[PDB]
Amino acid sequence: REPMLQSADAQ
Amino acid sequence: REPMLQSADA
Amino acid sequence: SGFRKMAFPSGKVEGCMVQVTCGTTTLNGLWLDDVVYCPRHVICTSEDMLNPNYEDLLIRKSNHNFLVQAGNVQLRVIGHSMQNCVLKLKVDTANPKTPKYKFVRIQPGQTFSVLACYNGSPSGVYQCAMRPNFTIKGSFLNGSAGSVGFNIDYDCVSFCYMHHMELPTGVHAGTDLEGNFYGPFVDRQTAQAAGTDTTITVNVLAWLYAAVINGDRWFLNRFTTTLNDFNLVAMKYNYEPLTQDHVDILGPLSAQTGIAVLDMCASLKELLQNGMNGRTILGSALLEDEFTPFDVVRQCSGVTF
Amino acid sequence: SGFRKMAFPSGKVEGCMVQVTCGTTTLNGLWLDDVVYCPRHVICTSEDMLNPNYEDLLIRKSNHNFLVQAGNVQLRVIGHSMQNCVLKLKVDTANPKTPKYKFVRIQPGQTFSVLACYNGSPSGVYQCAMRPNFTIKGSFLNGSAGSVGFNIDYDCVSFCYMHHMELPTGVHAGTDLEGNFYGPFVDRQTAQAAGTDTTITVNVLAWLYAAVINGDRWFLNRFTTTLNDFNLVAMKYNYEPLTQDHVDILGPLSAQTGIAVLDMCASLKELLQNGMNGRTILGSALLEDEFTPFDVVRQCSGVTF
């Protein structure tokens, strides 16, 4: 699809 | 001709 | 005997992985001495990642905005700076598990080991290669940013890669440990596309040379070919054209086996045109293209790494 | 404006050049910290260059057999060891003129500044490119081995080459600062021959991008070509086949000009198939192949050191 930065949302 | 290591004398 | 894609033991690298959290965004960091290296987009929110101004976003943050968790202990950030596309977080404590390390830039075709990490903890290790399109065909999920690629040369741990993003085709892009991206990619979620995915030809020839050393030589032939004729055939099968330097790279393997590079090129040319036809090489039907000639010598020697 | 083969300022490297004498053999040495790096064949006699036993020759030598002269000062050698083809001589004084440095290994096509030295004193500085056959077309005489090739990035002096020998065809060969030779050459006076010298295609296109930036764009056409079709014409004129990674190296030049890489390739095809027709580019009648895309960016940005 589109390029995404592979960090994550904080939990 | 052979390859020459280019180090000077003396 | 035998040859297989091998990664370095990741024990020394696991001790350098930490978790870096900025606001609601978290990723992995590399803790060497009193500096923590993490991808600069950790300061981005979910909405900032479209077209961020990293100089603008970095001024918004202070030292206490960076939560660095080394295992089960929070590290105190006493300084921060941006080098290209990576963040340098100075902490008050030097990592006691810091091994002998160096920051190097690998080249397309070369191989390195990747330690996939999430939340500062290691989850897997695999050996990959810098593809011709300056990407890597790895396995990365959300939160894998900050994972490092590395090689082990004697005593030194050569950090050469650090993960950032994934491209639309499923391949991955990153930078070196100085923040310079590999290829024409930028750490933002705008429209980007990788180059044509081709096969590293010089590594396939090294794989064929390793098969001859191992004892597999049913693919050899009495024929030789020119560099131009092989490249005209290799280009039709999406193989990278062989350069003169890549021929000299296979020199030691050509001298050890007594088979010239252009001799082995006629074998690969026949394997592409006629096909494998239901036969395997080194116990595999596919031609491995992430096995450099230096990897052939490493597994011939049995050297510890 | 203007584009030309330009070397880095040699002032920082001049303060690290010393003369290494072992018996009747003089060489140049690189003095960094308390270690003097020099080619290991300085321990070779005049009649012991055919097949010297380097391991046996170094054992028979002691610290008193090495005369290290830094201008008018004689540095006392307190230790000696061998790292591949490079000799490491530990001295009792650390060079204060040691700049921030690192040891890197360049690739074919890349450029670097060569500081020609004789008797430990700098003679000349010029820009060289690592040819596809892993040689350089320098100007080296007897006693020039030990001269170093280097690049300057920001405040760091990146050493990448150390001169060793001259090949029969007049080209020159050497190692990196770790002792590993560039190409399938050995520091022995036995039968050795370099590969076929070809034109570095990615540098010619970078030179065409420089001319375009300089306002020289008479060669630009409206036609486009595929990567495979361009390589078929290129290798017919002894040009290196353009790999996919080299297309990405021209990225910053393609973005700065807005001309696609494959568009510049089609302009090179017409220039090769039809010739220059009594015309010049950047004041040159022939195309230059020792100008990397980094050299184009470096000269149009004017970064000081």
Q: Do chains A and B touch (3 or more CB pairs under 8 A)?
A: no
For residue C219 the two structure tokens come to 């693919």
The H or E element containing residue D231 is helix D227-234
> Distance (Å, rounded) from C-alpha C7 to C-alpha C136?
15
Q: Which chains touch A (3 or more CB pairs under 8 A)?
A: C
Write out the E strands in C92-138: 101-103, 111-118, 121-129
Does residue D49 sit at the C interface (CB-CB below 8 Å)? no
- Per the CB < 8 Å rule, is B3 touching D166? yes
Compare CB distances from D244 to C232, C240, C245 and report the shortest one's residue. C240
The H or E element containing residue C246 is helix C244-249
Place of tokens 């009594």: D278
Contact D247, D261 (CB under 8 A): yes
**What single DSSP character describes residue C22?**
E
**Cβ-based neighbour number of residue C252 at 10 Å:** 15
- Burial classification of residue D18, based on how many CB atoms lie within 10 Å of its CB (0-12 exposed, 13-18 middle, 19 or more buried): buried
C261: CB partners within 8 A, 6+ apart:
C205, C247, C250, C251, C254
Compare CB distances from D244 to C104, C132, C247 and report the shortest one's residue. C132
Contact D204, D142 (CB under 8 A): no
Compare CB distances from D26 to B1, B2, B7 and report the shortest one's residue. B7
For residue C220 the two structure tokens come to 């050899």
Place of tokens 């950047």: D282
| DSSP reduced 3-state for C114 | strand
Does residue C51 sit at the A interface (CB-CB below 8 Å)? no
> Distance (Å, rounded) from C-alpha C252 to C-alpha C23?
53
In one-letter notation, the amino acid at residue D238 is N
Whole-angstrom CA distances from C12 to C30, C292, D76, D149, D287 are 12, 23, 38, 33, 49
Contact D246, D290 (CB under 8 A): no
Backbone angles phi, psi at C148, to 5 degrees: -110, 145
Residues of C in contact with D244 (CB under 8 A): 108, 132-133, 195-196, 198, 240
Residues of A in contact with C163 (CB under 8 A): 6
For residue C121 the two structure tokens come to 């903890």
| DSSP reduced 3-state for C202 | helix
**What single DSSP character describes residue C14?**
H
> Distance (Å, rounded) from C-alpha D209 to C-alpha D133?
25
In one-letter notation, the amino acid at residue D57 is L
Residues of B in contact with D38 (CB under 8 A): none
For residue D255 the two structure tokens come to 């973005």
- With CA atoms as reference, the chain C residue closest to D240 would be C243
Backbone angles phi, psi at C146, to 5 degrees: 95, -15
In sequence order, what are the beta bridge partners of C79?
A: C90
Name the region of D140 (left: φ>0; alpha: ψ -120 to 50; beta: rest). Answer: beta
**Cβ-based neighbour number of residue D8 at 10 Å:** 21
Find, among D73, D74, D79, D66, the residue nearest to D27 by Cα.
D66
Secondary structure in 3-state letters for C136-198: ECCCCCCCCCCCEEEEEECCEEEEEEEEEEECCCCCEEEECCCCCECCCCCCCCCCCCCCCCC
For residue D152 the two structure tokens come to 């300057």
The terminus-to-terminus CA distance of chain A in angstroms comes to 25
> Distance (Å, rounded) from C-alpha D162 to C-alpha D260?
37
Place of tokens 């004129």: D237
Whole-angstrom CA distances from D293 to C193, D7, D26, D201 are 21, 15, 37, 11
Rg (CA), chain D: 22
> Distance (Å, rounded) from C-alpha C149 to C-alpha C23?
26
Backbone angles phi, psi at D279, to 5 degrees: -120, 165
Does residue D99 sit at the C interface (CB-CB below 8 Å)? no
CA D228 and chain centroid, separation: 30
CA D232 and chain centroid, separation: 29
> Distance (Å, rounded) from C-alpha D109 to C-alpha C244?
11
Contact D79, D34 (CB under 8 A): no
> Distance (Å, rounded) from C-alpha D82 to C-alpha D54?
9
Does residue D159 sit at the B interface (CB-CB below 8 Å)? no
> Distance (Å, rounded) from C-alpha D63 to C-alpha D43?
12
Q: Which chains touch B (3 or more CB pairs under 8 A)?
A: D
Contact C15, C29 (CB under 8 A): no
In sequence order, what are the beta bridge partners of C32?
A: C35
- With CA atoms as reference, the chain B residue closest to D43 would be B7
Chain C nearest-CA distance from D244, in A, is: 6
**Cβ-based neighbour number of residue C70 at 10 Å:** 20
The H or E element containing residue A8 is strand A8-9
Contact C238, C133 (CB under 8 A): no
D259: CB partners within 8 A, 6+ apart:
D209, D212, D220
Backbone angles phi, psi at B5, to 5 degrees: -70, 120
- Burial classification of residue C97, based on how many CB atoms lie within 10 Å of its CB (0-12 exposed, 13-18 middle, 19 or more buried): middle
Pairing of the two strands D73-75 and D66-70? antiparallel
For residue D181 the two structure tokens come to 């030779």
Pairing of the two strands D77-83 and C86-91? unpaired
Q: What is the resolution of this structure in A?
A: 2.3
Secondary structure in 3-state letters for C192-245: CCCCCCCECHHHHHHHHHHHHHHCCCCCCCCCCCCHHHHHHHHHHHCECCCCHH
Contact D263, D101 (CB under 8 A): no
Rg (CA), chain B: 8
Q: Do chains C and B touch (3 or more CB pairs under 8 A)?
A: no
Q: Classify domain C11-91 by CATH number.
A: 2.40.10.10
Find, among D129, D105, D112, D291, the residue nearest to C105 by Cα.
D105
Q: Classify domain D201-301 by CATH number.
A: 1.10.1840.10
For residue B3 the two structure tokens come to 């390859």
- With CA atoms as reference, the chain D residue closest to C102 would be D102
Find, among C115, C192, C213, the residue nearest to C159 by Cα.
C115
Residues 234-293 of D with CB under 8 A from B: none
C12: CB partners within 8 A, 6+ apart:
C97, C99, C152, C157
| Residues D268, D107, C205: CA angle, nearest 5 degrees | 90
Whole-angstrom CA distances from C193 to C86, C126, C167, C189, D191 are 22, 24, 7, 11, 48
Does residue D183 sit at the C interface (CB-CB below 8 Å)? yes
> Distance (Å, rounded) from C-alpha D43 to C-alpha D62?
11
Write out the E strands in chain D: 17-22, 25-32, 35-39, 66-70, 73-75, 77-83, 86-91, 101-103, 111-118, 121-129, 148-153, 156-166, 172-175
Pairing of the two strands D101-103 and D156-166? parallel
Method: X-ray
HSE of B4 in the Cβ direction (CA atoms, 13 Å)? Answer: 14
Contact D150, D13 (CB under 8 A): yes
In sequence order, what are the beta bridge partners of C102?
A: C158
CA D24 and chain centroid, separation: 28
Q: Sign of dihedral through CA atoms D94, D97, D101, D107?
A: negative
Contact C140, C234 (CB under 8 A): no
- Burial classification of residue D222, based on how many CB atoms lie within 10 Å of its CB (0-12 exposed, 13-18 middle, 19 or more buried): exposed
Whole-angstrom CA distances from B6 to D142, D145, D163 are 4, 5, 8
The terminus-to-terminus CA distance of chain C in angstroms comes to 18
For residue C195 the two structure tokens come to 């180059």
> Distance (Å, rounded) from C-alpha C82 to C-alpha C84?
6
Contact C65, C58 (CB under 8 A): no
For residue C6 the two structure tokens come to 């091998």
Residues of D in contact with B3 (CB under 8 A): 165-168, 173, 185, 188-190, 192
Contact C142, C41 (CB under 8 A): no
> Distance (Å, rounded) from C-alpha C239 to C-alpha C77?
48
Chain A contact residues (CB < 8 Å to C)? 1-10
| DSSP reduced 3-state for D293 | helix
In sequence order, what are the beta bridge partners of C44?
A: none
Please report how the helices C227-234 and C261-273 are oriented relative to each other, as an axis angle in degrees rounded to 10.
Answer: 30
Find, among C10, C30, C116, the residue nearest to C42 by Cα.
C30
> Distance (Å, rounded) from C-alpha C271 to C-alpha C275?
5
- Per the CB < 8 Å rule, is D143 touching B7? yes
- With CA atoms as reference, the chain B residue closest to D170 would be B3
Chain B nearest-CA distance from D128, in A, is: 18
- Burial classification of residue D20, based on how many CB atoms lie within 10 Å of its CB (0-12 exposed, 13-18 middle, 19 or more buried): buried
Q: After which residues is chain C broken (C to N over 2.5 A)?
A: none
Compare CB distances from C145 to A2, A3, A7 and report the shortest one's residue. A7
In one-letter notation, the amino acid at residue A2 is E
> Distance (Å, rounded) from C-alpha D297 to C-alpha D305?
16
Residues of B in contact with D187 (CB under 8 A): 5
Compare CB distances from C244 to D132, D248, D251 and report the shortest one's residue. D132
Q: Which chains touch C (3 or more CB pairs under 8 A)?
A: A, D
